């Protein structure tokens, strides 16, 4: 069933090249350390999928999606807020990670 083991993640940066801020997430499973890139919408897709499958509380919520043009602003606060959310996600699944979360953590949004 659940066979992916525990992972740790931190938001270590972000970038805004085009339209949407992209977040840089450092991940480790104890064997390797790597980074993946995800946008807010990717976190929202992730979240909606976890809620629907009754794996997390509808109570826990990701950072509100920015309406309109993203700007290079409130970087520190946005990164921390995102990290708080992500680490709460991981703490909901001690020891063993749901397939969909493990997949999110291994591959960039554009892969």
From Swiss-Prot:
<feature type="region of interest" description="Necessary for binding to phosphoinositide-3-P; not sufficient for targeting to endosomes">
    <location>
        <begin position="8"/>
        <end position="111"/>
    </location>
</feature>
<feature type="domain" description="PX">
    <location>
        <begin position="8"/>
        <end position="111"/>
    </location>
</feature>
<comment type="function">
    <text>Acts either as the functional imidazoline-1 receptor (I1R) candidate or as a membrane-associated mediator of the I1R signaling. Binds numerous imidazoline ligands that induces initiation of cell-signaling cascades triggering to cell survival, growth and migration. Its activation by the agonist rilmenidine induces an increase in phosphorylation of mitogen-activated protein kinases MAPK1 and MAPK3 in rostral ventrolateral medulla (RVLM) neurons that exhibited rilmenidine-evoked hypotension.</text>
</comment>
<comment type="subunit">
    <text>Homooligomer. Interacts with GRB2. Interacts with PIK3R1; probably associates with the PI3-kinase complex. Interacts with IRS4. Found in a complex with ITGA5 and PAK1. Found in a complex with LIMK1 and PAK1. Interacts with ITGA5 (via cytoplasmic domain); this interaction is direct. Interacts with PAK1 (via kinase domain); this interaction is direct and is increased upon activation of PAK1. Interacts with LIMK1 (via PDZ and kinase domain); this interaction is direct. Interacts with LIMK2; this interaction depends on LIMK2 activity. Interacts with RAC1 (activated state).</text>
</comment>
<protein>
    <recommendedName>
        <fullName>Nischarin</fullName>
    </recommendedName>
</protein>
